[PDB]
């Protein structure tokens, strides 16, 4: 079920435009400190560091705020929305601008900006400015890194037996179930000094957890070896958390976790314990079960795209989707996928908008076999 498509245009966000003022990322923070950052309202999105955000700006005061941010530290703060409305926020992330284009178009200003997350934080207070853009008191959250669990109890003499030869070949049977067995046998050999077996220590190994997650991802859809998957557990965990089909509360729980190992364990538990989905306002459907969650993009099954009216929707690309009805013609105006034509998909029961049917425009592609859902109404069970 493979189609000759270049999985770089959905990430490139070519639907907005091409003549974009490319900006290089050179922002950071002093780690675990108090800061003040302006917040752009009217955004309902839990954002993870490394996740791409496409934004459309309409109100003049928001345009002024983003322009001042550009002539400043070009980082705003995406707030974390819980179930309770009215800015019931306790966490958030900092988004960095790398993508600025104004274009007053019909004489407005419509700043089109694309940003990604860089750091996490917690809001201490939400100060409201009379201008219309609230600047909140921000405490930057450090990202903890932990050493190997065998470093403390390791035997000094058998430390030379700790550099294993590089992994043999790739994606080959018995090149993993034996190499990893030997790796566990030789790495956590000092577990005999403690009260816990080797497999328990491998349950907390950063490398082993990433290997398990990679196996599960390949079970979902074929990933091209090291298909842009970072070797660092930090970025790997962040990417996995970004691509998982989970609701807002699960995303904020993954965001508050401060250690990569705990994040990887939580993600592996989530995708080994959640199989059935549903849509809000029904709580009665199971459209698009896990075993068919494809990924027709570099970033993964889930990504962020924006309509021509500022509204941002995160979509889930799946192979098949039943229990749906169609309204409207297969338009090709502002489809986020250049080689596809979009159609409005309505829920067959609650008639609350979930999904978009897609059709064919070319030859070497999948004709009318495509679906992109939304997190507007999508929860796991």
């Amino acid at each position: 079920n493979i189609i000759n498509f270049d999985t770089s245009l959905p990430t490139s966000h070519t639907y907005l435009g091409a003549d974009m003022e490319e900006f290089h990322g050179r922002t950071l923070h002093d780690d675990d400190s108090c800061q003040v950052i302006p917040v752009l309202p009217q955004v309902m999105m839990i954002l993870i560091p490394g996740q791409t955000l496409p934004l459309q700006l309409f109100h003049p005061q928001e345009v002024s705020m983003v322009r001042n941010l550009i002539q400043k530290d070009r980082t705003f703060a995406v707030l974390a929305y819980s179930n309770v409305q009215e800015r019931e926020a306790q966490f958030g992330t900092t988004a960095e601008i790398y993508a600025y284009r104004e274009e007053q178009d019909f004489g407005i200003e419509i700043v089109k900006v694309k940003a990604i997350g860089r750091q996490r934080f917690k809001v201490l207070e939400l100060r409201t400015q009379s201008d219309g853009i609230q600047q909140a008191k921000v405490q930057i959250l450090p990202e903890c890194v932990l050493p190997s669990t065998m470093s403390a109890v390791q035997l000094e003499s058998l430390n030379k037996c700790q550099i294993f030869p590089s992994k043999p070949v790739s994606r080959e049977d018995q090149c993993s179930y034996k190499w990893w067995q030997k790796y566990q046998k030789r790495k956590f050999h000092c577990a005999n000094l403690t009260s816990w077996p080797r497999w328990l220590y491998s349950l907390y190994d950063a490398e082993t957890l990433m290997d398990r997650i990679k196996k599960q991802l390949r079970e979902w859809d074929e990933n091209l070896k090291d298909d842009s998957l970072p070797s660092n557990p930090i970025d790997f965990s962040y990417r996995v958390a970004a691509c998982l089909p989970i609701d807002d509360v699960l995303r904020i729980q993954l965001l508050k976790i401060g250690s990569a190992i705990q994040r990887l364990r939580c993600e592996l538990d989530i995708m080994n314990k959640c199989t059935s989905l549903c849509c809000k306002q029904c709580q009665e459907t199971e459209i698009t079960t896990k075993n068919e969650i494809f990924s027709l993009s570099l970033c993964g099954p889930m990504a962020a795209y924006v309509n021509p009216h500022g509204y941002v929707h995160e979509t889930l690309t799946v192979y098949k989707a039943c229990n749906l009805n169609l309204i409207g013609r297969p338009s090709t105006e502002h489809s986020w996928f250049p080689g596809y034509a979009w159609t409005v998909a309505q829920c067959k029961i609650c008639a609350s908008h979930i999904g978009w049917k897609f059709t064919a425009t070319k030859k070497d592609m999948s004709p009318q076999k495509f679906w992109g859902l939304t997190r507007s109404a999508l929860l796991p069970t």
Binding site: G328, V344, Q346, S352
Partner: peptide, 26 residues
């Protein structure tokens, strides 16, 4: 020009567009 914004649904009249808008509401 009758077209929804929360969704993207397109219409040739206004009654169904308003029905869609109020269905989005709530």
């Amino acid at each position: 020009p009758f077209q929804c914004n929360q969704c993207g649904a397109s219409f040739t009249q206004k009654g169904n567009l308003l029905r869609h808008i109020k269905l989005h509401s709530g």
